[PDB]
A paper describes a structure:
Within the structure of this complex, we identified the OD (259-302) and XD (302-399) regions of the P proteins. We then modeled these regions in the cryo-EM density map to obtain the structure of Lc-Pe. Based on these findings, we built a more intact four-helix bundle of P-OD into the model of Lc-Pe. The other built region of P proteins was of similar length to its corresponding region present in the Lc-P complex structure.
NDV RNA genome is replicated and transcribed by a multifunctional 250 kDa RNA-dependent RNA polymerase (L protein). The P protein adopts a unique tetrameric organization and interacts with L protein.
Author numbering:
A (entry chain E): 236 to 343, 350 to 399
B (entry chain A): 8 to 544, 553 to 583, 588 to 611, 629 to 888, 894 to 1194, 1209 to 1265, 1278 to 1302, 1310 to 1384
C (entry chain D): 236 to 311
D (entry chain C): 236 to 306
E (entry chain B): 234 to 301
Write the structure that this text describes.
């Protein structure tokens, strides 16, 4: 029927009128204020570039100036922390995650040790005796860190 | 005076070696101090002008000794005053000729013992083993050549290197102990002993022992415990040199030890106090020498090289570089060539150069460095660990409470996965914990777990030394040493400062009122708490309130929260270790998806673990448990108290060096102090830290996608990264996947421990495919790796400090010898080594005694033979039977002692007079109370042990002033008389049963009072208080002092020197349980009246069977003799007992052996035992209700239905090494009767004979070995008696009970 | 003329925008929650002690002594 | 005249209630996960507040969200 | 004769509403997706990147100096 349908259609499109004109100027202003409130959180988190040794404990300090992710550190303890920062604002950690007042402490082989260990490997592992005598014989002949390593990987493969 | 002959000065070192004690008696005497003590901080600061003006006996002896030593050294040169350890190489080689003669007097008598008794000790060991292995082996019975060298050299203890100094230090030790005892009583006698040794004189006082050398004009001074340290180490290294030279698989170590000792002593003179850094490295070389034998080339040789580099890097700071090279070359030569066992053996060399001298300053610096240090942890890694923490609590509470999550604050369940898993109440897997760590880290809880504050009560009855409060802290030090302004501050000790005593005097002790010291934050208001740190290398002195809350929090975490984390406790710490090392590659190599699993192992070294925790890292982990208990602030008390308090290192002889230190809140973070300790204290708060580390280990296992079976007791973390492989996969792929997974896991574990603040090192830890370390025991390939030579260094010659006790001192040697037999040494060696050492013991106590009689029996050599060889139950000293060498002490002792006496007579060792004098021995006192408290026993006349007497006396004295509301019904006026009356009621019946009455009285409240009394901490400083507040008396204390004499004379009178003309009807050729039953009946006859004391004796397991190894043809001459009741033991042929595990038959774990209050379980135990013993009728139930009424609060209709079935219900030390016992097959089919106690012992006897077939020099097997332990043709087969029921004549005693105590009563009617 | 089933498919089609504009004010209300919550957070993080060079945001051990002078409080 | 405005009406109504109703549940679920990603912001700030020993009497039975709103 | 005026008011109402709703509902989506991208930068600079300092008193000064 014409009238009984037109009444319900007019009522529901008035519901849509009440949707749109309240939905737009409120929600768009609220998300602009929402973005201006999340950007001020983004701009209040002062990074500090922690320069861990981690596990790669090489020399050449600038490498750990290079591989140093930034972090917003949060003081959760009593006292003064200022003798653990740097002109520039960077805090270097120990292997125990301890800050250190001078970051030069992070970056701070022989031949007798390696010969001793490979002799221990030859004498101690299961082996035919003449082959043990052979590898001991061509070990006092060695004279570098290299080619002791050749004997080391030769003994461990039999 | 007899009061001063009870708490004797100790014979072995059980205390730290303090430097400034020794320097006090050095400066106090007149001598010149060493050059390294000239600018010392306590020497220069003290006012010695007043300290030397006391003229006590403490100082006048030192003055006379400073006059006396100074005369025999010239004025022509400078007197050098060498301080320990720079005097090690001298005192190592000390030679007093006097004490050498005085011990060779003993040596001659031991040579007489061997010449009179060596062939019957051959006959015993070649008869018993012949009997148990049958006539298929009677052409293969030859003695071991550990026994034979012991036989040809009787004086092993006297003819080794180190012996001539071992004589000297034992002599100087006993002289100084005698001088202390004689200086206790106020007298004016000769308080000085001078001895003469090769190039010099030895001066002995109560405090110092001073050794001089005249040719080099030097002298060393030793404090009281420093001569204990030298005396322990000389007989330690000499006994090592004995054992490692007479044992065939160990003789190659004998040079390698004698080098490394005499080497490092030479390094003592220039390194000095730092040579123990070289001694602390000696453990890593014994580890790395095992790590040289890996299956693949990876991990082999890494840690040996690391320790070798560290040994060089320490020696080059002090030595010339040529000497560091030569020494490092020597160390690397010593620890190479060794087997697996022979590199486990080099761990003996740990205590074998002694202990460094301690001080408070240099031990407080090493705590300020690592405890007042800044840290920077990762919050986003705290969240990743806290995710697994909350997830593990969720799954533990789920598994404990039938599949229910804890009471989550439900507005904090974030995300579609975690809301789903709560809505199903399912189990979080580790992957969801890793992925959803942001959501799972933020979940809260409500008060769903109800604790119990005093759960354990054994930890409150410990004697932990309590710091006096911080206004009195200078009472920690000797008031002799405080300056005058600091003498104004010390008050008097009203308390004893003991947690044992001040807990029992505690009026108004409520646990829930006392936890409010923490939850209400009053403990941090409290301006009286001072903590004190110990001198060690785990212990601290707290105040009373804070120590109480410490023990409560430990108990609550230990019972409620910690078993959530699987707990990873006697065999469960070695079944879950021996089967964990079945997961190595070499344990399962017959076979080589989801059909096989293997592992590789990481044992880690965390640097300064317990004191790198911070409040910032543990706060949230504590927060997740304060919520789960309904507590505002409980489990983070440690850091918040130590931030606000200042603590110091506690030592009497180490005061603060500055004389203007009055108050703790004004001292600088300096000399002995620690101000605002951010870190933890070791031992304290251990449960929470163990749980955080388990969460981090599981976190890193999930971040590399692997499965981990860890185990951690702090920083003793042992991780087994596993990988499941195929039976048909190549071995290189298996050992490649394992090493890849190990590298990934180790990298992530470094990473997750670094970000919470814990350095586990890359090189210090021990990765291996094969072995791992737990409690200094090395587990390698499904076996435990031998420690005979650690135990040989503990083999000593005095044991006990309560009297001159020879019985306990022979018991100590007996146990240590049994422990060597467990680590793999022959039987015939160890038994006769026990005999020779008990001879040396009983002659060592005659001489050298510090209590000035014995001359009648001490030269009677066959008496001393028959005394240390007769068992201690029958009267003598031999606790170590021949049966204890094969198995463990399960079973009846009396039958075993009679079986030993029957064997010792049957071979001709022990005389035939002595067994008959045992059988005719007059009875003792005899009680119903004593026969109830000690079944299996005899009523022979005996004297009471001073340990038992003084322990019982202290238990009775401490519960006199017992005034706490808890444990109030423990000590009553008639708690003795209830025990006497209850024993008279239970025992005196138609058929006397002692064992079941022991079970009943232990179950009832009388045994409950006994059990709670037996939890107090009877240290010697507790026995001193309980003697100083109620003295022992006159007759008891005279029995204490003359105990060894009375015991020896009692054996001499009763059974050795006796006539006993009315010999009984019992013969000597019967089974020994007949003689044990005759002796129990005849002994208790003036008390029993003639009734058979029955239901006690068991057979002896050795006596019962006559074993037989089969021959080639099969079928035994014992089973061809008309016998089919035996046990089947099978051993497969061709077993390589070493690394080559290619073709071994299946290795398995070898044979080792609800929801109510435990008061109710003890009550039902009483009901079950009473009804099964004395029949089932309502007269018995009338009394059994009355007995169970003492413990619980139930009624009679519940007891008749809740009563259990009538039953038989009336690492540290592994039971052996397991070499062929993982490979032996057991079939108990043909023994149709005993399929209990008998077969549990016959199994272990067979499996001990099988591994006694093969020594430690044999790595292969060559035949299948079968045993038939036949027992039908035995004298000890006797029928079980007919249980004729009856009724308990009379009425049970009243058994009065308090209902307020939760420790003793259960008022809730179940 | 007959426009019957045309009006019927209009009656069909309005139900889609019925359920979606029914869901619209709930989204608007949740934008109002997120605004206040993000405002609370940017209020908080301005007074936390994120470290800069200059180190003026330090707490001492006197704050532990001062704050722990009472029974612990409940903020929820 | 009525049929042309009728078909213009139904064209406009049909395609715009296609695409607005297509657009709504997408932005609905995104404002949903904004809630569960903003709740854990307060939760982690309540975790960060209690690590300092200046706030130890903030008793654990309280809410970490409430400590975020504590000030 | 009434339904003509009815649909004449109706079509401009329906079109005016839904055309002034389309061009807001789609920038609503792109703006809220830009805001979800925006808040993840605080989900990392506050959550992941955050380290916890304790200025441990590695000095020589009394507790009454540290109680200041």
């Amino acid at each position: 029927e014409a009238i009984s349908q037109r009444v319900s259609k007019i009522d529901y499109q008035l519901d849509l009128v009440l949707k749109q004109t309240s939905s737009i100027p409120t929600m768009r202003s609220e998300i602009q204020q929402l973005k201006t409130s999340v950007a001020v959180m983004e701009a209040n988190l002062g990074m500090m570039k922690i320069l861990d040794p981690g596990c790669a404990n090489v020399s050449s300090l600038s490498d750990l100036r290079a591989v140093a992710k930034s972090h917003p550190v949060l003081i959760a303890g009593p006292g003064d922390p200022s003798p653990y920062v740097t002109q520039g604002g960077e805090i270097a950690l120990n292997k125990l995650s301890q800050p250190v007042p001078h970051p030069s402490d992070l970056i701070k082989p022989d031949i007798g040790i390696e010969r001793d260990t490979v002799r221990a490997l030859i004498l101690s592992r299961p082996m035919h005796p003449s082959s043990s005598s052979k590898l001991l014989s061509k070990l006092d002949s060695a004279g570098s860190v290299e080619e002791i390593r050749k004997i080391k990987r030769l003994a461990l493969n039999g | 005076r007899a009061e001063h002959q009870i708490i004797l000065p100790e014979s072995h070192l059980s205390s730290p070696l303090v430097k400034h004690k020794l320097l006090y008696y050095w400066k106090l005497t007149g001598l010149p101090l060493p050059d390294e003590c000239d600018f010392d901080h306590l020497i220069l600061s003290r006012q010695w002008k007043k300290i030397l003006e006391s003229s006590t006996p403490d100082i006048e002896r030192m003055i006379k000794l400073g006059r006396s030593v100074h005369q025999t050294l010239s004025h022509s040169s400078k007197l050098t005053g060498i301080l320990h350890p720079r005097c090690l190489e001298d005192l190592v080689g000390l030679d007093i000729p006097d004490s050498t003669n005085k011990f060779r007097r003993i040596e001659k008598k031991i040579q007489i013992h061997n010449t009179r008794y060596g062939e019957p000790f051959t006959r015993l060991c070649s008869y018993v083993e012949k009997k148990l292995l049958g006539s298929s082996w009677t052409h293969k019975i030859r003695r071991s050549e550990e026994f034979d060298s012991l036989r040809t050299d009787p004086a092993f203890w006297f003819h080794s290197s180190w012996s001539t100094a071992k004589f000297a230090w034992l002599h100087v030790k006993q002289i100084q102990r005698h001088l202390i005892v004689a200086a206790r009583t106020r007298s004016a006698s000769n308080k000085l002993v001078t001895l003469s040794h090769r190039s010099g004189q030895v001066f002995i006082t109560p405090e110092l022992v001073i050794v001089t050398h005249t040719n080099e004009n030097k002298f060393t001074c030793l404090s009281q415990e420093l001569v204990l340290m030298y005396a322990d180490m000389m007989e330690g290294r000499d006994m090592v040199n004995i054992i490692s030279s007479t044992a065939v698989h160990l003789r190659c170590l004998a040079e390698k030890i004698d080098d490394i000792l005499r080497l490092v002593d030479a390094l003592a003179r220039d390194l000095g106090n730092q040579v123990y850094d070289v001694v602390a490295l000696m453990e890593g070389f014994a580890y790395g020498a095992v790590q040289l034998l890996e299956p693949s080339g990876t991990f082999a040789g890494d840690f040996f090289s690391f320790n070798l580099q560290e040994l060089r890097d320490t020696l080059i700071c002090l030595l010339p570089q040529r000497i560091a090279d030569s020494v490092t070359h020597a160390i690397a030569n010593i620890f190479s060539g060794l087997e697996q066992n022979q590199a486990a053996e080099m761990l003996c060399l740990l205590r074998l150069w002694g202990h460094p001298l301690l001080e408070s300053r240099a031990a407080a610096k090493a705590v300020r460095a690592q405890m007042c240090a800044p840290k920077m942890v990762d919050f986003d890694m705290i969240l990743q660990v806290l995710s697994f923490f909350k997830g593990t609590i969720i799954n533990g509470y789920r598994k404990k409470n039938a599949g229910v999550w804890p009471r989550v604050k439900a507005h904090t369940i974030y995300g579609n996965v975690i809301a789903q898993l709560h809505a199903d109440s399912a189990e979080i897997s580790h992957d969801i914990m890793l992925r959803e760590y942001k959501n799972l880290s933020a979940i809260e809880f409500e008060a769903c777990i109800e604790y119990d504050p005093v759960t354990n009560l054994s930890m409150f009855l410990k004697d932990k030394a309590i710091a006096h409060p911080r206004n009195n802290w200078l009472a920690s030090f000797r008031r002799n040493l405080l300056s005058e302004e600091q003498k104004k501050n010390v008050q008097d000790s009203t308390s004893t400062n003991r947690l044992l005593i001040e807990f029992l005097e505690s009026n108004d002790f409520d646990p829930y009122k006392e936890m409010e010291y923490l939850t209400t934050l009053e403990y941090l208001r409290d301006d009286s708490v001072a903590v004190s740190y110990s001198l060690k290398e785990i212990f601290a002195k707290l105040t009373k309130k804070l120590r109480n809350c410490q023990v409560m929090a430990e108990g609550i975490l230990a019972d409620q929260i910690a078993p959530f984390f699987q707990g990873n406790d006697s065999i469960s710490l070695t079944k879950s270790m021996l089967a964990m090392s079945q997961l190595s590659y070499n344990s399962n190599r017959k076979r080589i998806k989801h059909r096989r699993r293997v592992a590789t192992f990481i044992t880690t070294d965390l640097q300064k673990y317990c004191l790198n925790w911070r409040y910032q890292t543990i706060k949230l982990f504590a927060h997740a448990i304060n919520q789960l208990m309904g507590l505002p602030h409980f489990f983070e008390w440690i850091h918040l108290r130590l931030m606000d308090t200042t603590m110091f290192v506690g030592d009497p002889f180490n005061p603060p060096s500055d004389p203007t230190d009055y108050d703790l809140t004004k001292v600088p973070n300096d000399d002995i102090y620690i101000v605002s300790a951010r870190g933890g204290i070791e031992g304290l708060c251990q449960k929470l830290w163990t749980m955080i580390s388990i969460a981090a280990i599981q976190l890193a296992a999930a971040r590399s996608h692997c499965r981990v079976a860890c185990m951690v007791q702090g920083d003793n973390q042992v991780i087994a990264v596993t990988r499941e492989v195929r039976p048909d996969d190549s071995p290189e792929s298996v050992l490649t996947q394992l090493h890849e997974a190990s590298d990934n896991f180790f990298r992530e574990l470094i990473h997750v421990n670094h970000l919470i603040g814990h350095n586990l090192k890359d090189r210090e830890t021990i990765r291996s495919d094969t072995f791992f370390i737990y409690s200094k025991r090395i587990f390698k390939d499904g076996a435990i790796l031998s420690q005979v030579l650690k135990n040989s260094s503990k083999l000593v010659l005095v044991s006990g400090d309560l009297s001159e006790n020879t019985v306990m001192s022979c018991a100590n040697i007996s146990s240590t010898v049994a422990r060597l037999c467990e680590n793999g040494l022959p039987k015939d060696f160890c038994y006769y080594l026990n005999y020779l050492m008990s001879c040396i013991q009983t002659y060592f106590d005659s001489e050298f005694s510090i209590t000035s009689s014995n001359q009648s029996w001490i030269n009677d050599i066959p008496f001393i033979h028959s005394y240390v060889l007769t068992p201690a139950q029958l009267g003598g000293l031999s606790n170590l039977q021949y049966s204890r060498l094969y198995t463990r002490n399960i079973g009846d002792p009396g039958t075993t002692a009679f079986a030993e006496v029957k064997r010792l007579e049957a071979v001709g060792l022990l005389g035939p007079n002595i067994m008959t004098n045992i059988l005719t021995r007059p009875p003792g006192n005899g009680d119903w109370a004593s026969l109830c408290n000690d079944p299996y026993s005899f009523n022979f006349e005996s004297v009471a042990s001073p340990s038992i007497v003084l322990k019982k006396h202290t238990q009775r004295v401490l519960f006199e002033t017992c005034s706490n509301p808890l444990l109030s019904g423990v000590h009553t006026e008639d708690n003795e008389a209830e025990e006497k009356a209850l024993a008279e009621y239970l025992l005196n019946q138609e058929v006397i049963h002692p064992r079941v009455a022991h079970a009943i009285m232990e179950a009832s409240s009388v045994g409950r009072r006994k059990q709670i009394q037996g939890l107090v901490d009877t240290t010697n400083t507790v026995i001193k208080i309980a003697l100083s507040r109620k003295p022992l008396g006159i007759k008891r204390l005279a029995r204490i002092i003359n105990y060894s004499s009375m015991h020896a004379m009692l054996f001499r009178d009763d059974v050795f020197l006796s006539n006993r003309a009315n010999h009984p009807l019992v013969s000597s050729d019967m089974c020994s349980l007949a003689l044990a039953d005759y002796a129990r009946n005849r002994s208790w006859s003036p008390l029993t009246g003639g009734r058979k004391i029955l239901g006690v004796s068991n057979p002896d397991t050795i006596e019962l069977v006559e074993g037989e190894i089969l021959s080639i043809s099969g079928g035994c001459s014992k089973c061809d003799s008309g016998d089919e009741q035996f046990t089947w033991f099978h051993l497969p042929s061709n077993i390589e007992l070493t690394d080559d595990t290619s073709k071994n038959p299946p290795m398995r774990v070898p044979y080792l052996g609800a929801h109510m209050s435990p008061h109710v379980k003890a009550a039902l135990r009483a009901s079950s035992v009473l009804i099964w013993a004395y029949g089932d009728n309502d007269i018995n139930w009338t009394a059994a209700l009355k007995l169970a009424r003492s413990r619980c609060n139930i009624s009679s209709e519940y007891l008749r239905l809740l009563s259990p079935l009538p039953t038989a219900g009336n690492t540290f030390t592994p039971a052996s090494l397991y070499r062929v016992s993982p490979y032996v097959h057991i079939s108990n089919d043909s023994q149709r009767l005993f399929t209990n106690v008998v077969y549990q012992q016959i199994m272990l006897l067979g499996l001990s004979l099988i591994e006694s077939l093969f020594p430690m020099t044999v790595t292969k097997t060559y035949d299948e070995i079968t045993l038939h332990l036949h027992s039908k043709f035995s004298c000890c087969i006797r029928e079980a008696p007919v249980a004729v029921p009856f009724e308990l004549t009379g009425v049970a005693p009243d058994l009065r009970v308090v209902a307020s105590n939760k420790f003793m009563y259960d008022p809730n009617p179940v």
